[PDB]
Symmetry: C4
Subunit: 267 residues, 4 copies
């Protein structure tokens, strides 16, 4: 069975077929957005849906047989797995968010197209080196969220009532979103020094952001420089090695000229 | 006989005449916004617009005569054509929006001045490399527009009731424009976890934008370095040949002292 | 006589004195904003002002004596002149504006501290290359402001009633300042397709800005690379001269014996 | 007593222990944000807070006997010192700002974890270089703050009534926060030319921000290219001397080919 399966799964027809289904299913999901469309064609697309997820379920199964344990070490396959699994949770449930979580299957367009994987992968590649700064930042947010909650939560429960609330508001302030007329001018009417809290906050988060970006650019180009430097330097020291080695064969060719005469009379 | 007219079209005087017209018609169109001006002088100015529109139409004709098919595969000319043709439809119609489009004709200043031409050209040229990421992003908006229509379009039809609406709203949020007090805080009064939707959306969308720019700057530098790697490397292996050929003149000079120095040593 | 003055004006005491007067003047001008401070013992300050204005006028005359015609080819000195100038015109009634323009004379601390002068200078030096992109963007605003007045000014005269008002509003939008809930959502309630105007506008205007920053950085690095690839090439061709010169005479240690041993055959 | 104490504070056990106490205290401090929690667990965590403060204090004392004079010239230990000191001030007072400042001691996670220090340290090194730009900007605000107060203060005391208030409003305008519908448009209802003040303000503060960033980037790369140039020119430095040492050595062995020619002269 294996090779018979393996050769259908690995084919140029298979993945092409899936992509095509994904794109159709994606057009189909936009149409289900229009209740007008749904009362006039909804039955056609409610099962187009149901059989596409059938095909994807089958595809997922075959691919597991064809790849066995190496399937679940694949980030992309793992995603396909979970994003399909989700659509298998019953279309009528107590948790009804999962029905909307079904739309994530359109991200298989990313999974199955290598230009897209390329993009995404490039994007992800910058993150591991940011985690420490992510960390420093989250710790910064958390300390200030605690302070803001103790300082402002009593009189301003909506914005600062709760740590989670102060977290939310501090993010808002970070995005510079209606932070003065909308948040701290109102705070200052009760707490005139509130600006000594939020303006340093704004300096720090903005400083950290910019410099992260700056640091990325500059450190990338410092590696590009090093890699270029060695090339130039290898070429300089294989080419100036010859001019050194060629003159030595002349410094030598004259000392052997010299001896030829050093054994002239002698005898 | 192309050539009789062809020398007129290619002349310094034809182009400068048109640029002079554009800048004049452009001054004209401004004053046409003043309602008081259109009393005291509206008739003079409608005249000028009709004159200019004629002149422009002729110049396009000549230019098609001179350039023939090469005219309709030149984007600059295509734009001049589509912007002049538009400007020729009757000022009173069913869709009178075209009356407003004829101000686009002022962009011929860009089109006719090579300095400007080159700016616009430089700007356009980052786009083809980007088309993939623009596609990722559009797909991203689209998936999120659908989810957002479903999650919030019932209670918030103005912001999310229709897919286009969710799109519009999602763009506003990307620009960070009044996104918390104006959209998300309202949403959370009905849907307390709505921050689980918009804050990741903001993270992804900002992250992509920043990394696109970063990736442009770093990779531009990379090729700036590749070619200066090759200029330097080509010169150290050129200079070596300059030392080399005036060292092959110390080769013959001692292989000729090689042939004849034991000859000088006779008995 | 000229030198006796010149040696005063050029001394580290003249400049220290003026800088000192500038900081004091700048401290009192802040104090003058307080009406408390102003009524009780604020007549002291009004005369201090007139003492400083004369001293600066003296400073300027002397400086014109010392530097003569080259004074007025100095942008820093010109700035100094005109800034002290407007502070000389009397507190003419109904010219209330010039009273506050006087404050512009604290920009002399910039004019007079070499460190300040250098940042400012560096900042100015970015501009001459940009004047094309500036022109392009200005024209772009003009075309859009004309279209906007025409499309939106009868129904939204505060925002768009006038070319001027339209420029102002398009600038607000460019800064993404309350652009959607505050301008475009209201517009769309009369004109549902208004998003076809502002969203493209926002794309172009933001695209042009990012790329202007991008192209500055990158083209700077190109120039930075052009310089370092020159120094390398010049230090490579550097000793190539005196190496090829010292071994064409090392070819002449052998070239002589064309006659030193061949004439020995002629005994 | 020393080494024994020294073997304690230098141990991997010591640091790990107090890092765990930081993280633990960090969690309990989040919990103290809850009124529910504080009610039925408060005395449990108010003690833990007292416990931790003592331990950090003995820790600070020990680290001092081990490091002594060096300790007080260590910025991280100075920080450590001072946020522990703050927590050592008694809560009972009129000034209860200090009870909130206690949670600053959680920044000790920054001082205690080397990848943290490294990032904070990287961030800081940016600052001394840009202090001159900061002085320029602060000056610019001050001058404009003064003009603002005198121009708009009487009619708009909330935003401009006072030097300090204008500073605040001008900072809001610089972050582009609700600057037009929120501040400048209202102002233009009384003062139609107010845009002649705020749009230049926006242009300058934006320009300077962007350019500062562009400057850090371009100048960091200028420096990288200098190190790179030297290292490369250093290579051309070593190698174009050892080919002139092989020349002198070629001459020193060719100055044997005029006195060993002295073996001719026989016939
Ligand atoms: C340099 C890169 C930037 C890093 C900056 C990260 C700093 C934090 C940014 C995110 C802030 C928003 C957090 C969230 O908006 O807060 C809400 C959450 C629960 O609060 P809630 O349900 O009571 O209120 C919710 C609203 N309601 C009152 C109506 C129910 O609070 C929770 O602590 C959220 C804890 C935040 C964890 C952050 C994860 C790191 C992301 C890296 C990927
Ligand atoms: C100094 C370094 C130490 C590291 C700190 C680790 C963080 C541990 C989490 C803290 C738990 C506090 C729970 C909160 O106190 O619950 C109160 C509140 C409901 O309050 P209630 O009692 O009135 O409800 C009736 O729930 C909240 O709003 C929603 C919960 C918000 C989650 C907080 C996000 C923490 C982000 C970790 C980043 C750490 C730095 C790397
Ligand atoms: C890189 C950036 C990533 C892409 C950014 C996407 C931003 C999309 C703009 C959203 C557009 O403003 O949404 C409106 C449009 C029609 O919706 P509506 O007629 O209900 O107008 C609603 C208004 N009203 C109810 C008063 C009639 O939605 C349209 O059909 C949806 C099509 C959106 C364009 C798809 C490709 C754009 C990529 C640019 C390159
Ligand atoms: C995963 C693979 C996806 C494949 C590409 C997806 C493109 C399919 C477009 C689907 C059309 C849905 C039209 C919408 O369902 O009509 C809803 C609404 C009419 O409402 P009503 O019928 O109740 O009126 C009484 O009008 C609407 O908002 C008008 C605007 C509709 C917005 C279309 C934007 C699509 C751009 C995404 C391209 C992706 C690039 C890779
Ligand atoms: C990269 C940089 C991009 C540069 C593009 C920026 C253009 C300037 C935007 C601001 C326009 C200005 O805020 O609008 C005001 C002014 C007319 O004021 P108003 O009396 O009509 O009403 C004012 C409102 N009120 C009715 C309440 C009294 O409009 C004037 O035409 C302004 C003309 C535009 C300024 C030209 C400067 C550049 C010159 C070429 C190089
Ligand atoms: C292809 C085009 C290139 C040629 C560029 C030429 C620009 C010169 C155009 C001058 C027309 C002024 C418009 C008019 O004067 O408008 C009158 C308006 C209302 O006055 P009203 O009482 O008659 O109301 C009823 O008042 C205004 O809004 C008050 C101030 C508005 C001044 C706008 C000047 C901006 C021009 C810079 C463009 C640079 C392009 C490179
Ligand atoms: C690179 C970017 C550098 C840009 C730096 C520009 C300066 C940022 C502006 C700070 C604005 C905060 C404001 O200024 O706060 C007001 C403060 C005291 O005034 P107030 O008590 O009336 O509070 C008014 C509030 N209420 C009356 C309702 C209670 O005004 C005082 O002049 C504070 C003067 C601020 C000194 C600025 C230090 C900058 C150095 C950073 C390193
Ligand atoms: C060229 C000049 C350079 C030297 C300038 C150095 C700064 C001199 C400080 C002047 C203080 C004026 C305070 C103001 O006159 O008091 C008004 C107000 C209370 O007024 P009241 O009397 O009606 O209360 C009953 O309180 C105010 O808002 C409190 C805020 C005070 C603002 C502090 C500004 C410092 C920024 C330094 C610039 C750095 C340059 C490199
Ligand atoms: C810890 C740093 C950020 C901290 C910071 O803010 N650093 C100061 C920067 C330079 N300054 C301009 C201040 C110059 C000062 C003097 S200098 O002589 O440089 O001019 C981290 C955060 C994310 C990291 C990078 C990314 O993961 C991606 C990338 C992966 C590659 O594996 C190699 C590098 C690279 C570029 C990473 C570099 C660096 O690991 C980064 C910037
Ligand atoms: C517009 C410019 C400049 C000069 C020019 O070509 N002006 C045409 C006038 C018509 N004439 C009758 C005078 C010549 C007819 C025959 S002739 O083929 O010898 O042109 C002409 C120069 C040579 C032309 C291209 C190339 O050829 C190659 C290429 C052929 C393809 O098809 C399509 C495109 C393409 C890129 C051409 C485009 C363009 O059109 C070009 C750029
Ligand atoms: C798809 C990529 C962008 C995706 C991305 O995010 N890419 C790299 C990550 C960079 N990081 C520093 C994060 C990785 C760390 C390791 S690294 O070794 O970078 O230090 C695309 C987007 C736009 C593209 C360019 C532009 O059209 C312009 C330009 C045209 C020229 O014809 C030559 C290339 C160039 C520079 C294009 C290169 C590249 O086609 C780009 C960046
Ligand atoms: C060239 C541009 C305008 C034209 C343009 O819009 N250029 C876009 C390049 C797009 N990309 C970078 C993607 C190309 C990558 C493909 S490529 O194959 O390059 O990798 C102009 C506008 C502003 C100018 C600079 C500034 O005055 C400052 C500065 C002054 C100095 O006097 C010298 C340089 C410098 C850096 C100026 C250089 C440049 O004159 C600039 C960038
Ligand atoms: C550490 C160095 C020198 C190295 C050393 O070793 N110093 C003595 C400790 C010796 N041991 C640890 C070997 C003994 C424990 C024996 S055991 O059987 O317990 O392991 C010496 C140099 C300077 C000395 C101190 C100062 O003058 C003054 C100072 C006053 C204080 O108010 C009390 C003591 C104190 C701290 C002094 C302690 C110690 O003198 C110091 C730190
Ligand atoms: C005062 C200057 C800012 C001046 C400015 O605003 N702009 C320069 C013009 C850039 N342009 C491209 C326009 C030049 C055009 C021609 S050019 O072709 O020469 O590029 C200051 C502000 C911040 C300073 C740096 C940082 O502390 C970090 C860093 C520390 C390191 O210890 C060494 C360098 C470095 C990069 C510092 C360099 C520089 O001391 C900076 C940029
Ligand atoms: Ca905003
Ligand atoms: Ca380089
Ligand atoms: Ca707003």
């Amino acid at each position: 069975m294996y090779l018979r399966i393996t050769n259908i799964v690995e084919s140029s027809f298979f993945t092409k077929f899936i992509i095509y289904l994904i794109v159709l299913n994606g057009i189909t999901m936009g149409l289900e957005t229009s209740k007008t469309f749904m009362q006039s064609f909804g039955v056609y697309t409610t099962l187009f849906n149901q059989i596409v997820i059938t095909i994807f379920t089958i595809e997922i199964i075959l691919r597991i047989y064809v790849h066995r344990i190496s399937f679940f070490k694949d980030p992309w396959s793992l995603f396909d797995f979970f994003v399909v699994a989700i659509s298998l949770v019953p279309t009528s449930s107590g948790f009804e968010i999962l029905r909307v979580l079904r739309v994530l299957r359109l991200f298989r367009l990313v999974t199955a197209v290598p230009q897209m994987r390329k993009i995404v992968s490039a994007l992800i590649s910058v993150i591991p080196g940011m985690l420490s700064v992510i960390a420093l930042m989250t710790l910064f947010f958390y300390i200030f969220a605690i302070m803001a909650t103790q300082l402002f939560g009593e009189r301003f429960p909506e914005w600062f009532g709760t740590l989670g609330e102060s977290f939310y508001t501090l993010f808002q302030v970070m995005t510079l979103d209606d932070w003065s007329n909308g948040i701290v001018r109102p705070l200052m009417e009760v707490y005139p020094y509130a600006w000594v809290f939020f303006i340093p906050f704004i300096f720090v988060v903005t400083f950290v952001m910019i410099n992260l970006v700056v640091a990325i650019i500059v450190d990338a180009m410092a590696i590009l420089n090093q890699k270029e430097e060695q090339h130039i330097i290898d070429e300089v020291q294989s080419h100036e090695d010859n001019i050194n080695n060629e003159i030595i064969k002349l410094r030598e060719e004259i000392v052997e000229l010299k001896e030829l005469i050093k054994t002239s009379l002698k005898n």
